[PDB]
């Protein structure tokens, strides 16, 4: 065995563990989610596991979807000098075209044999795994300050008397047993002798700190396009209440969509409809209020 | 909240020393004023003085011998049916220091 | 919060020096008032005076020899069942400087 604990400022190591674990957790959660936002009229007719596509797109490798046996299996694809042949690395096994491939972008609208590359972002300047590191430390220390604020927001009622058995019988039989009408000696024995340590310099501070945590989440959120935007259009709470500057959050949402524009180039080739929409739906009540067809009653209940 | 009193102390310690108030010699002496203990504490004779000066003031006397009886009288008949604070007799030695 | 007291200190150090309170010579002496330690600390004899002047006041005496007994008495019987602050005896040397 080996044991000799520090003190009870162990909490001052537990506090910094909460901050450190919050940064690690929020960082890898936020990129645990971020490669699924778009999902684009999900599997109309096309054999793509779009989850495996979007995970590949957020490590910035240019995937290439084409035909394999007329059914659109993904492949990897790493002034205008045109690409034609299957020179690139190919991830499937025997489903390779073994024939004339092409990029279907500008050779014509809708004619050439399909192997179209899809960028994550049309013009690439900085990776957004750096922006997610940029705010999560700032977010980490505001989560530190919230946790440190509510950890010292606890309150005792200090009794103050010369020690051995004068005031103990008082609080036992007449405060925590709830008793009104306790009788005492005239020796100033509650003339502000019992005192309260309060932290009312802490609870007005508490709510404003939560609002700073909240709008910093929102200021990370609208950067990476994930937004509450369309419902904010129909709710009429459009500007300076949701302090987000709508023209910037509809801006950063749009860059990721027109990065995945070459799926429309593919969609024009084989005669089908694939639009890169932007997912904001969460179900069992939204699907109920949009239909209210009695077959949807036998589906849910 | 309730603990030991001080009338009960010197009553019990004086009844430890052979005294009584009901059947003292052989006759019924409950009504006789020179025998029950409350008169012995208000008169504050030699006897109660000895038991206070041994159990309460265990190592004290004042300067004179006429003032010292006055102080011990004015202490022990102000506080007969009062209380005790520090929970045990021969352990409220706070009395000796406030002396 | 609880640590060492001061009654327990001089009780344990006086019982280190061969004394006892129950079976002292051979007869049962629990009830005999001149043997148990609380009376030796309230009377504050030569013996407790020696052990306080060696373990608590390890290099001190006051000016006179009649006041100095009064100060050491008025210290050690105010603080018998009190407490200790700096967590170790022979390490509350804060007592010697506040002396």
């Amino acid at each position: 065995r080996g044991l000799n604990v520090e003190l009870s400022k162990e909490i001052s190591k537990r506090v910094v563990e909460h901050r450190n674990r919050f940064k690690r957790l929020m960082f890898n959660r936020y990129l645990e989610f971020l490669p699924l936002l778009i999902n684009y009229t999900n599997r109309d007719t096309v054999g793509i596991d779009f989850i495996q596509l979007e995970s590949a797109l957020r490590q910035n490798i240019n995937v290439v979807v084409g035909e394999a046996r007329n059914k659109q299996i993904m492949i990897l694809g790493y002034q205008k000098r045109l690409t034609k042949e299957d020179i690139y690395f190919i991830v499937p096994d025997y489903l390779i075209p073994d024939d004339c491939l092409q990029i279907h972008k500008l050779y014509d609208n809708c004619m050439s044999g399909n192997f179209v590359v899809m960028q994550n972002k049309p013009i690439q300047y900085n990776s957004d795994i750096e922006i997610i590191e940029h705010y999560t430390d700032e977010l980490a220390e505001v989560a530190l300050s919230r946790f440190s604020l509510i950890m010292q927001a606890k309150f005792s009622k200090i009794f103050k008397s010369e020690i051995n058995d004068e005031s103990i019988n008082q609080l036992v039989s007449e405060i925590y047993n709830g008793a009104p009408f306790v009788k005492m000696s005239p020796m100033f024995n509650a003339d502000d002798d019992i005192i309260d340590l309060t932290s009312n310099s802490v609870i007005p501070a508490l709510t404003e700190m939560k609002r700073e945590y909240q709008n910093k989440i929102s200021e990370l959120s609208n950067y990476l396009g994930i937004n509450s935007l369309a419902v904010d259009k129909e709710s009429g709470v459009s500007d300076e209440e949701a302090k987000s500057n709508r023209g910037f959050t509809t801006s950063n949402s749009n860059i990721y969509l027109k990065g995945r524009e070459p799926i429309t180039f593919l969609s024009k080739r084989y005669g089908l409809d694939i639009k890169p929409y932007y997912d904001d739906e969460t179900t069992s009540k939204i699907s109920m209020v949009d239909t209210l067809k009695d077959e949807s009653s036998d589906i849910n209940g | 909240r309730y603990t030991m009193t001080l009338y009960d102390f010197i009553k019990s310690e004086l009844i430890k020393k052979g005294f009584n108030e009901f059947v003292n010699d052989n006759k019924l002496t409950f009504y006789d004023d020179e025998f029950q203990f409350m008169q012995k504490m208000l008169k504050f004779d030699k006897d109660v003085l000895a038991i206070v000066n041994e159990k309460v003031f265990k190592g004290f006397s004042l300067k004179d011998e006429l003032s010292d009886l006055l102080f011990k009288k004015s202490f022990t008949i102000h506080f007969l049916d009062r209380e005790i604070n520090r929970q045990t007799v021969e352990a409220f030695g706070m009395q000796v220091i406030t002396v | 919060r609880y640590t060492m007291t001061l009654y327990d200190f001089i009780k344990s150090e006086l019982i280190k020096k061969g004394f006892n309170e129950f079976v002292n010579d051979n007869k049962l002496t629990f009830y005999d008032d001149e043997f148990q330690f609380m009376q030796k600390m309230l009377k504050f004899d030569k013996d407790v005076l020696a052990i306080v002047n060696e373990k608590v006041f390890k290099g001190f005496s006051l000016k006179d020899e009649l006041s100095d007994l009064l100060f050491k008495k008025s210290f050690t019987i105010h603080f018998l069942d009190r407490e200790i602050n700096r967590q170790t005896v022979e390490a509350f040397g804060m007592q010697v400087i506040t002396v």
Binding site: - | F9, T88 | L80
Partner: peptide
């Protein structure tokens, strides 16, 4: 209910417990 001390009597037992508290006298 209505906690009453219906006896209120006289005693003949004696006490000087040479001890700091009730607790140390129990010890």
């Amino acid at each position: 209910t209505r906690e009453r001390y219906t006896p209120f009597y006289d005693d003949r037992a004696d006490y000087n417990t040479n001890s700091k508290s009730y607790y140390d006298y129990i010890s």
